[PDB]
Symmetry: C3
Subunit: 263 residues, 3 copies
């Protein structure tokens, strides 16, 4: 199957024409949308969503990742194969930073084989359709990785500050605010569990000049409605939520904001 | 096929990872999205959308319904088989109230068979992925209903006031406001047709302290642009619309608001 | 495959029930969404999106186009076969104006064969589900075009002013503003290239009483961030964009607005 992720939105016909290209190459391709609502040009956001979503895709899944503000420039077009046997077709702009780091990379190929393109003359601003999508289609059909082009020994990396436990607390950043307003961080719940806390315990959440108390819970329903809670989200990351409410609003925080969890 | 309905939104990667789980279990599963834009935690809204959409799905369709604010709590996870031979995989929070009432229930099973789960250790807040979705996948693949777990003799019901015809009028509630602003009620068009009215007749619509006149019509185009009309929507429910306009705005009404249709 | 385009939105269960009808008729149907976010009743917008998207669909693709404010009225329901061998199932309201003009029409059939319908008694306001969708399904399954109904010798056309090159400049209109804010016109990039301009050249963009200078470029990245550029979009149309910005905001323009490109 193909894991599809972009910042194109579902309003435009872009996603659709990309899917038609894939289907023309391989009518049996299974295209699963991770999301096409990554904020415009937000590769950082895509890098996290990509990793988190990939955890539930099987090995040998071909990911088509296109948040590519540098489309048509000298930036490289690449295919990365990670050590957990997954493949990623994307621009070399750092969007594959998280999967590379978390999974480790087995090999990287630069997209050079023009026989794999949709059109002999690729448009300058829509490689998603003319290059990436058709390459993902071929790979998902069984094209050997080496037929993509030459190997690359390096790739662009996005700078990321690794969250740590210092002085009974863990400092991190808001990685993703979902539609419910839940606030997921880049702080692994295992790391948090190093402050020697446990479910039913109460901790402190510091955002900006604000400080809140919050129960460590398993389910939203574990606290009264409207109350705050700290818990492991579906991907193993520490998330702050308001039971039947919007934590992003209560905390008044946005993606990228620094967050501190104190015992 | 699988009818998929949630309040997760399409912006998050949630819908996607759920679909990947289904596809991993059964690559041939046909997943049709009813909608993933039910307002957060709005089971009432989902219960109506579910019923209305189910009318066009064939018998033996497996519905995956996940608007589950009580995820991870003692609330039961169930599979309901209705008398029209459709199946519903959902939380026992009343979201299956309308199909149960309208179709009648043949049997209910509590989800207990852990061999049907996606993960041996289900996350606390995303049973949609770890329990419901994989159970729907197995059922759609032909798993006998009894393999799901033990039978249940009752289920949670949402309180709903049945609309009636009293004194040349029918009182009801706004069930769904669609993207055009059309205002669909919970009033069956057949019931309305008891006030001895007919197409081309004019009736009165009362909302709040407001009263409007509206023609009973078949098509929006049956009245001048901007005019109000009362008609049967695609599911047989009385709906109020503005031809080439937004009735929710003109009436200034929202879902749940009481509505009165007077001869 | 079936190219699906409507103004129904993805929030409602409408798109879903239409897809279930198609799948019931032909479980092997490949439904590719072009977009369901065309503004309500905006056939003009749909006519352009349709054409632009069709360029990447293969010949023999069956397009299901339903932006039908006149649903249930005397307006005809038709199937148009163009000279590039594509088929379009739609209301005869002018939504097929652009493909007809650009591709030329080989034949038009009025939908008359009721054996092709979803329901013996079609709803008055949702022919998308009861007539169009099932007809598209049958055609995609191989139903000969003549079985649809009698031939029609004419069809509704939307009035459109053809952009031209007069006095070193080209006047046109904004056809589509995408999610990035890019401003695509109805001006073919080939026509623009008649003003004897070339990449790296600078031209003038006139909107309203405003005038801007903009570089003619290939990729957004070809200019500094925040700068304006004129380039050919993925469909060959002249588009104005802001590198890593929103041109619709900078120009303060909307679809339908007249635009002038001066040497
Ligand atoms: N105005 C723009 N400036 C820079 N990049 C853009 C712009 N519009 C679209 N893109 C990029 O084009 C890519 C698709 O080819 C998208 O991933 C998007 O990030
Ligand atoms: N902050 C929250 N409070 C209560 N329930 C939530 C919250 N966020 C998500 N959910 C529920 O989690 C379910 C998916 O596991 C969704 O159906 C949603 O209703
Ligand atoms: N209030 C309305 N007035 C006119 N047309 C409408 C209205 N609501 C929905 N439609 C049309 O119904 C069609 C689907 O049957 C849509 O394409 C839409 O354009």
């Amino acid at each position: 199957m193909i894991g599809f992720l972009t910042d194109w939105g579902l309003k435009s016909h872009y996603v659709g024409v990309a899917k038609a290209v894939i289907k023309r190459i391989n009518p049996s391709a299974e295209i699963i949308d991770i999301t096409h609502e990554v904020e415009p040009f937000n590769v950082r956001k895509a890098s996290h969503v990509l990793y988190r979503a990939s955890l539930d895709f099987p090995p040998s899944t071909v990911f088509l990742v296109v948040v590519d503000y540098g489309v048509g420039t000298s930036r490289k077009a690449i295919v990365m194969k990670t050590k957990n046997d997954q493949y990623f077709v994307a621009p070399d702009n750092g969007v594959l930073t998280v999967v590379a780091e978390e999974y480790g990379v087995a090999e990287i190929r630069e997209i050079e084989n023009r026989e794999l393109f949709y059109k002999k003359n690729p448009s300058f601003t829509f490689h998603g359709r003319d290059i990436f999508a058709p390459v993902a289609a071929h790979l998902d059909m069984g094209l050997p990785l080496e037929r993509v082009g030459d190997r690359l020994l390096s790739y662009e990396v996005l700078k990321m500050r690794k969250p740590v436990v210092e002085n009974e607390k863990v400092i991190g950043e808001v990685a993703i605010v979902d539609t419910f307003g839940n606030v997921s961080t880049n702080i692994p719940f295992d790391l948090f569990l190093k402050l020697s806390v446990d479910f039913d315990d109460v901790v402190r959440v510091r955002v900006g000049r604000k400080e809140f108390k919050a129960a460590v819970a398993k389910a939203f329903g574990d606290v009264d409605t409207g109350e705050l809670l700290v818990h492991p989200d579906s991907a193993g990351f520490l998330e702050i939520a308001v039971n039947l409410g919007d934590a992003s609003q209560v905390l008044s925080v946005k993606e990228g904001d620094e967050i501190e969890i104190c015992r």
